[PDB]
């Protein structure tokens, strides 16, 4: 999802359904390489 070689265009935006895992959001919360990181329905710290 994130370290992908190539994306698609905005008018052909790529959708992927992620299912059946234990997602561990705090490392993706913690990476400073992502400039804008902001959440709307949920406060981001409660994702764990």
């Amino acid at each position: 999802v994130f370290n992908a070689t190539r994306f698609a265009s905005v008018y052909a935006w790529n959708r992927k359904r992620i299912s059946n895992c234990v997602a561990d959001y705090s490392v993706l919360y913690n990476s400073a390489s992502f400039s804008t990181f902001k959440c709307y329905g949920v406060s981001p710290t409660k994702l764990n």
Partner: protein, 49 residues
């Protein structure tokens, strides 16, 4: 009453308090108004009885 949910624990399990308070304010305002309506109607009925 405009809140995201009618259940208290879901906000608390989801939100950070400086917006959770903005939701809980709506919730307690609506419920307190309903309670005031109930007690007023009870007073009137009790006078008639």
């Amino acid at each position: 009453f405009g809140a995201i949910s009618s259940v208290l624990n879901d906000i608390l399990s989801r939100l950070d308090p400086p917006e959770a308070e903005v939701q809980i304010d709506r919730l307690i305002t609506g419920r307190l108004q309903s309670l005031q309506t109930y007690v007023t109607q009870q007073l009137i009925r009790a006078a008639e009885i």
